[PDB]
Design a protein around this ligand. Structure first.
Ligand SMILES: NS(=O)(=O)c1cc2c(cc1Cl)N[C@@H](C(Cl)Cl)NS2(=O)=O
Ligand SMILES: NS(=O)(=O)c1cc2c(cc1Cl)N[C@@H](C(Cl)Cl)NS2(=O)=O
Ligand SMILES: NS(=O)(=O)c1cc2c(cc1Cl)N[C@@H](C(Cl)Cl)NS2(=O)=O
Ligand SMILES: N[C@@H](CCC(=O)O)C(=O)O
Ligand SMILES: N[C@@H](CCC(=O)O)C(=O)O
Ligand SMILES: N[C@@H](CCC(=O)O)C(=O)O
Ligand SMILES: [Zn+2]
Lengths: 258, 258, 258
């Protein structure tokens, strides 16, 4: 039984392998999460099909509709057997899907175009010149939507009324937006992505500040999926074998272009 | 059946005719909106009675009570069939009443007694010496109250807290307050009134800076009224036949005194 | 359902990005109306497909055939769910389609090559040296065609009978013609496009005089469409949150080249 892995195009976790669009199969993709999926499938002894979540969303439960979209939805509604993505372990997702132990640590972080007078979330919150937003339908946005933390809950008050929307559809759009914004837009996103981008040409962005929180990417499987246990042990195996570090190095730093 | 037209004594939209005491019914009044109402009535083929809004207000929803006052309330509660007044098309209002397309454009503008060291909203927001307020129960106030724009949020933060109240009940009061404040009061009001006032003796006020927002006056009708369509088309007709411009010229600039 | 947004390639409202040779769906497009469509959609919470009106016309009822072309037609004949375009609210159009409140004001204005012996429509109406025309199949043409106003009537009389046609198929054609005409052609186009063009290199054109009239672009939906309401409310929300002015700034002025 081929495990349907839901994942999302998000560098460097999962990326079309240059010139593999026209291709098919898992080999098309590359990235930390593709390798991870590999080491996971190998350690759990399963065949998997990497599928890119249709709506290209990580997963959020639509308010009112209550319907999970993105990779979470995939798992929740049985469209996918497992999500091997920079899928943030969050409480609201862990209620509806299972998460392996984190295979990666990240925090919400601020990406700014280099030179933006922003050193912290506080800075962002304390000012108006510089818009900032998050991926919509992602844990970051939810982090802010939900945070009682005075500075975030506020950053949210701003972001949620912000217009144009400070929310971007994709990390690339946030990043593009930061780059295109002449520093007038700060993108709140996961330090791992932020760190990846920081290391990619045009190298005009950087992570400033520490992370606004600490979380992890877990491999998500549907609630009570039998894969969960295997995958979880796999992740831990992988972690202890230094594979995750090896992978993170491979995908973040070994290709550093800055 | 005689259309009850709610309107508001607001120059030069609706004004008691110099005599007026010797006149009855519609003929008491003259002004852009009286003329507009005449042509709207003629073009929608209804007989109407101009009636001034009891509370002389345009209309805002009372927080807590959620009751609408002013012309909006007159429509909302079925005291009037139509509002033909410089009634600003706003989101909260369009939610409870219908507006023809705007028959007049306006923006929130600043009226200052001539010679006030203010050239913009940013200026007012940046200082404390010159008070500034808007008509309460009006769209200008609601604009600031609901504005997320840094400068206006600041301004609203100030105005909402200003003591004594920077808000006025009538434009006449705001205008008087400007004229009497020796430049210590800037009146945030709609450019149309501001322009009109600018052009009337004592010619001591002026609009400064551009409009803070762009909006329109719409002939309002109760949500889902039949008149709405007719009135809307009549407004478009009147607009296109140049009547609106002819009326605006007649009432704003033909009478100019400065 | 995915709302089908008809709109028109008209800078800066809707324009092909720059690599629209590598993007799909809505991201191929950029511009004020593209941004407008996005927030409109985000606020009305619908998915949309931007689709450029086939005939690249705005909408005019073909005399004799009585068939609406352009985006009006697209809406009138059910090909589009909504037009998010510099579509002029006009009487004839509101008779067949629904317009939101205007999301942008404009007036018919005269674009002349900078330094053209023209300062007004009266000026144009008085002379024959400077040809002037409008966009054909536009509200601007129809304004003149249908104008009862002596001057615009004379101008119409002139334009309709001017040879070669003073009318142009596109704004670019009109603009090019202004430029190429060494100032012997005045383009009567909406102030907004006039202003946009003014702001674009070669900066050889300018809006002269006031507008001949005042109208707005509204987001159009088929008559009695459910969307109309939400979109109208969206437009108002957006307008009040300063979005439309931000967009206007972003697309007109923030890239100003003159
Ligand atoms: N940085 S940290 O060690 O304090 C830290 C780490 C994690 C925290 C919280 C904190 Cl304060 N949350 C967990 C979530 Cl998955 Cl429930 N992940 S974590 O990276 O181990
Ligand atoms: N300039 S103005 O305020 O007098 C003005 C504005 C509009 C008018 C007419 C006039 Cl006279 N027409 C409407 C059309 Cl949509 Cl029926 N639009 S408008 O910009 O609000
Ligand atoms: N300044 S502008 O022309 O771009 C403009 C005009 C109107 C906007 C917003 C903007 Cl940004 N909002 C609408 C709503 Cl208030 Cl009914 N009216 S408008 O005058 O056509
Ligand atoms: N990793 C995030 C997506 C990126 C973000 O939200 O910043 C998630 O699972 O929702
Ligand atoms: N036209 C405004 C009143 C004037 C103002 O608010 O300044 C309204 O409809 O509320
Ligand atoms: N916006 C216009 C087109 C341009 C023009 O007519 O000048 C319309 O809706 O017809
Ligand atoms: Zn390969």
């Amino acid at each position: 039984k081929t495990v349907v892995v839901t994942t999302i195009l998000e560098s460097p976790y999962v990326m079309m392998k240059k010139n593999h669009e026209m291709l098919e199969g898992n080999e098309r993709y590359e990235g930390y999460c593709v390798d991870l999926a590999a080491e996971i499938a190998k350690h759990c002894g399963f065949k998997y099909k990497l599928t890119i979540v249709g709506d290209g969303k990580y997963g959020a439960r639509d308010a009112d509709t209550k319907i999970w979209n993105g990779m979470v939805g995939e798992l929740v509604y049985g469209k996918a057997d497992i999500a091997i993505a920079p899928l943030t372990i969050t409480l609201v997702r862990e209620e509806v899907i299972d998460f392996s132990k984190p295979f990666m640590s990240l925090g919400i972080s601020i990406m700014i175009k280099k030179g933006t007078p922003i050193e912290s979330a506080e800075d962002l919150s304390k000012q108006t010149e510089i818009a900032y937003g998050t991926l919509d339908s992602g844990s970051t946005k939810e982090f802010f939507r939900r945070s009682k933390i005075a500075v975030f809950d506020k950053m949210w008050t701003y972001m949620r009324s912000a217009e144009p929307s400070v929310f971007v559809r994709t990390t690339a759009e946030g990043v593009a937006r930061v780059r295109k914004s002449k520093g007038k837009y700060a993108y709140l996103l996961e330090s791992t992505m932020n760190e990846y981008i920081e290391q990619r040409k045009p190298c005009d962005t950087m992570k400033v500040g520490g992370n606004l929180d600490s979380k992890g990417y877990g491999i998500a499987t549907p609630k009570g999926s039998s894969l969960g246990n295997a995958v979880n042990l796999a992740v831990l195996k992988l972690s202890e074998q230094g594979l995750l570090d090896k992978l993170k190095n491979k995908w973040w730093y070994d290709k550093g272009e800055c």
